Design a protein around this ligand. Structure first.
Ligand SMILES: [Cl-]
Ligand SMILES: [Zn+2]
Lengths: 21, 29, 28, 26, 21, 21
């Protein structure tokens, strides 16, 4: 999930967009 | 629609706090 | 009024920074 | 007034995210 | 204090209400 | 830079103004 993927290394905008509806 | 945008930002944080482990499904008007 | 409500949220964030160890008392 | 002021707080938050290591000049 | 309580582990809504006037 | 100064220890308001224009 997003916390596991994005809370140690920074997620780019593209990576964050994977979590949109 | 800027005011609705700013309000929505604060609503998302409120849901984050109140929903806790339940999470929430957020959709735009 | 929601606009005042949102303003107050920013005010308490700002007071937290400005007041430091003094703290602050916020009330409606 | 303060509406622009509060909006600006959200704008600098948004630019911080969007601009990445490029950064921004506010 | 509140930092030693609610910044060492996440406080529930009930624990946060401790700080209301 | 501001990260090494102000994320490893708290910067006072006066220390923060040194990064203004
Ligand atoms: Cl706002
Ligand atoms: Zn706001």
């Amino acid at each position: 999930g997003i916390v596991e993927q994005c809370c140690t290394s920074i997620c780019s905008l593209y990576q964050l967009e994977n979590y949109c509806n | 629609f800027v005011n609705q945008h700013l309000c929505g930002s604060h609503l998302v944080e409120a849901l984050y706090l109140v929903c806790g482990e339940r999470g929430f499904f957020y959709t735009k008007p």
